[PDB]
Design brief:
The structure is a homotetramer. Chain A has 7 helices and 7 strands; from the N terminus they run βαβαβαβαβαβααβ. Chain A is an alpha/beta fold and about 250 residues long. Chain A has one domain: Rossmann fold (3-Layer(aba) Sandwich). Chain A has a 7-stranded parallel beta sheet with strand order 3-2-1-4-5-6-7, sandwiched between helices. The complex binds 1,4-dihydronicotinamide adenine dinucleotide (4 copies) and magnesium ion (2 copies). The site of one magnesium ion has 3 residues of chain A, from loops. Chain B: This is Oxidoreductase. Chain B: It comes from Streptomyces coelicolor (strain ATCC BAA-471 / A3(2) / M145). Chain B: Belongs to the short-chain dehydrogenases/reductases (SDR) family.
């Protein structure tokens, strides 16, 4: 019974935890009584997030992480086990971004930058998360942040679309591999979410994005945080290998 | 505030109608809403099974009432909905869980009347449920949420069960179109895709047959009704405020491979 | 080997063959040398189609069909086997329809008509086609005509979307059963097809849903259908093939 | 309207064309009358394939290609354009491979190897084919070779699954981008193909309702259909050629 303490005694690693969905998810894990590891490329921004967590009485600690560098990942996971005694839950959330351009004109470097963070980064994240969770070995749960663009395409963002599809596949294979050893792995596909930078777009564009969501609005970070934290929770014990939309019915048409 | 409100009062005030709620996924789902403080309408084709569920909910201190329902009959569906509104004063959440069933045989040999019985209960029934649910929800109008219980067999096929498979794909269909109509009217509409669920009756079957089913699920076991209900009730909740028009698996990673 | 004699000696039943996609599939089956049964609710339209094929040197014969009635589907299959000796191939194309309304106010009898023709019709089609193809018994191939609306929804059309999703489902389950017996069963998902004089901007509205920037043609769907029917697609089964100008890719 | 001349006066680039599906695709494009640029990391293999097609009355030319290197991909595209004047069609088939391990134990270098070839390789290919096909003004067609594992998972092959997923991805976004300008971009999803082990082979087969494995010719036929004008309203879509493998 209950939400307030359902993650008591548990350690949750959240990548890209300094901003947006990552931060909203860090806070949701805290509201559930989890012990939160705030991990981000932005060292001081992770500290700020984790300090704010502690100031609301949540147990949390910051760690500097770059998902593109396997050893930075391994260290972050080591920090989590070091700091809170185990690794139980993970939210692979770090991600960019990428410029908009047709495939034929797309910058090669931009492509690699996108794929390296969005796809490879998630692979590296799981690569070290899984042993630490398995060795524990009280089972566990991982959620990979994909996107609607992990299941449909988007004109002008081929790298991003590629990567995000890749996260979906990464999720299925891994879940097929681990479900029986009591580690659930799932992915979420959020639609376009309200953010400070998206709220700088001009009226024409923002409206365009909005009309693509039959819901009639963009999503909020919190709203993605709820889906993620559910799939992480014991209530979703038979949810494995699956990809869960939170897109205001963007992909239903 | 979701964390201020908590678990036991999450659904306080809200009226929830659940079809097929005398057993299996429906009963578990009825129980999970009640535990969250919902007012519960137990609807079933087994009228006695309904009353039993409602009564035992009431002893557990849940507000609940039973109603006889046959989803194949639009008139029965309408009356059941009217029963919920008449009994608790609104309709806010609904779970179209009623279904069967059907014989196993290849398409070339599949009994025609059996095909009819399966599609009308499984597909038509869900469309009727929604047909009368939506206006009841819309009129009030505080928005609301509807979950349709399809199946893994709504996204993949299964040899020997083409009527069942087709109806369940149909349910995914209903959910998408309906959700695109109503998402901007505050009514969110979703489906769940349970894998094979440890229903009581499929332990009577072969040692082998069971195991064959289990080997189809990477998680290495079959599901429990309570586990589906957990997903159903999250979709119904305000926490899933941006979830609409989508199909959500609760399987063994069945469909992952 | 050749294209004009690709379906030489094989018999093919096409439902709803008097008009649109069914008709174009019939013509494309004919040009490949197939024997063709033109089955359709509109008996006169079927005969007119059968006649045109015969003018082209194509063995073809008309038969009156209501996919809604199981006994009628059975007879249609019987007519195939009696006329040309065998049943090898089938395209389940007969379908409507459905007026528009939000799900909460949708016309119940209209939901009934739509499901019965589009979904039940396809099931009844396969129910009688398969034993005939099987008993032949050198195997065969069936394509069911679904839609983009077999994989995505469309506001205002719950019944149609439901029925077309059913068709995809019926396709996967049947194909699982019969794959090993040498009978391949697939589905196609056309986008909107030029079938005209709508509200000018309503058509443009429909066109804007297709990144290809135009609607599809009947013949275009038929090419995919006939490919899937052919021995070229010998390892294609249980799959749903889009012909939609990228409608569902976004 | 002429099987043997379906692609007459059209230039087709095929990656991984020295073996298996790419080789069979090349032969099928040739039998259809197309000019065929055989591209491979195996220079000698590519050359033995072009030579064989040439002996068959097919205009063909081989080029060395490493799809992980964007510069090597550009050079192949330019080589096709120079040799045959323009480029109209492309099959992006070069792929491996990859060791078998669970995700938590997977080799970091190998994951990269697999992703670099199978995903990045397809993007680099497209990145250079598109402006070339655009140049010819005539609007062509591109098919990418994904897999059943482009849409479903498979224990032990995380890198591969991810990459094949990214292919389907690239296909959708690129096709959305280019359909209006008259270039259709699609993907194929082959099941397991006979191209070894004990009765693990028997295990594979049992995963396909069809009751056998696929043949590289069977894949080729679907690919070439998609490239053809007969598939003129087919774009942005993923086409399975599996044994009903993904259907259950
Ligand atoms: N905002 C949206 O509309 C949607 C976003 N997503 C995904 O949700 C995830 C986060 O999204 P947002 O919160 O909105 O963006 P955000 O900008 O607000 O958050 C990104 C955070 O990840 C961190 N980060 C960036 N690169 C990193 C690296 N190489 N290593 C470690 N940390 C790194 C950044 O420091 C940043 O704090 C991303 O994967 C994004 O692709 C997916 C679908 C919808
Ligand atoms: N039990 C399983 O293995 C799985 C079942 N499902 C779906 O879960 C849903 C519930 O099934 P279960 O709980 O597991 O089995 P169940 O039979 O125990 O519960 C279904 C209930 O629906 C009622 N019902 C049947 N026909 C009705 C009608 N015409 N009108 C009104 N009520 C009717 C039944 O009396 C029964 O109480 C169904 O939609 C089913 O297709 C899908 C995947 C797993
Ligand atoms: N019109 C379009 O743009 C699209 C249509 N489709 C599907 O393609 C199929 C045929 O489409 P169209 O060529 O446009 O239709 P159509 O209107 O041009 O011709 C349909 C034919 O089927 C026959 N028919 C109708 N009901 C029947 C029944 N109960 N029994 C036997 N025959 C019957 C009609 O007499 C007619 O000859 C349909 O299943 C439809 O859902 C799918 C996607 C796009
Ligand atoms: N054989 C199978 O079971 C399936 C294979 N596929 C895919 O179809 C494609 C063809 O595979 P197969 O014919 O079966 O294998 P294959 O070994 O027979 O052909 C691979 C060819 O690509 C070439 N190649 C490898 N790395 C390269 C690089 N970095 N740059 C340029 N060329 C390179 C190889 O030299 C070889 O000639 C691959 O993408 C594969 O992933 C997909 C589904 C089923
Ligand atoms: Mg499967
Ligand atoms: Mg869409």
């Amino acid at each position: 019974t209950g939400y307030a303490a359902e993650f008591a005694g548990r350690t949750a690693l959240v990548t890209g935890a300094a901003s947006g969905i990552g931060l909203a998810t860090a806070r949701r894990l805290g509201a559930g009584g989890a012990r939160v590891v705030v991990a981000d490329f932005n060292a001081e921004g992770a500290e700020k997030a984790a300090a704010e967590l502690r100031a609301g009485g949540v147990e949390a600690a910051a760690v500097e992480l770059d998902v593109t560098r396997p050893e930075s990942v391994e260290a972050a996971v080591g920090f989590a086990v070091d700091t809170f005694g185990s690794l139980d839950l993970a939210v692979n959330n770090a991600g960019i971004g990428g410029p908009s351009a047709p495939t034929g004109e797309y910058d090669v470097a931009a492509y690699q930058r996108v794929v390296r963070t969005n796809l490879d980064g998630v692979f590296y994240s799981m690569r070290y998360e899984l042993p630490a969770i398995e060795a524990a070995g009280k089972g566990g749960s991982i959620v990979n942040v994909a996107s609607i663009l992990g299941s449909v395409g988007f004109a002008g963002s081929p790298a991003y679309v590629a990567a995000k599809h890749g996260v979906v596949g990464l999720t299925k294979a891994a879940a097929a591999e681990y479900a029986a050893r009591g580690i659930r792995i799932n992915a979420v596909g959020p639609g376009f979410i309200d953010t400070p930078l998206l709220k700088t777009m001009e009226e024409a564009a923002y409206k365009g994005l909005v009309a693509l969501h039959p819901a009639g609005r963009l999503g909020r970070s919190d709203e993605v945080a709820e889906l993620i934290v559910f799939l992480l929770s014991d209530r979703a014990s038979f949810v494995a290998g699956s990809y869960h939309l939170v897109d205001g019915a963007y992909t239903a048409v």
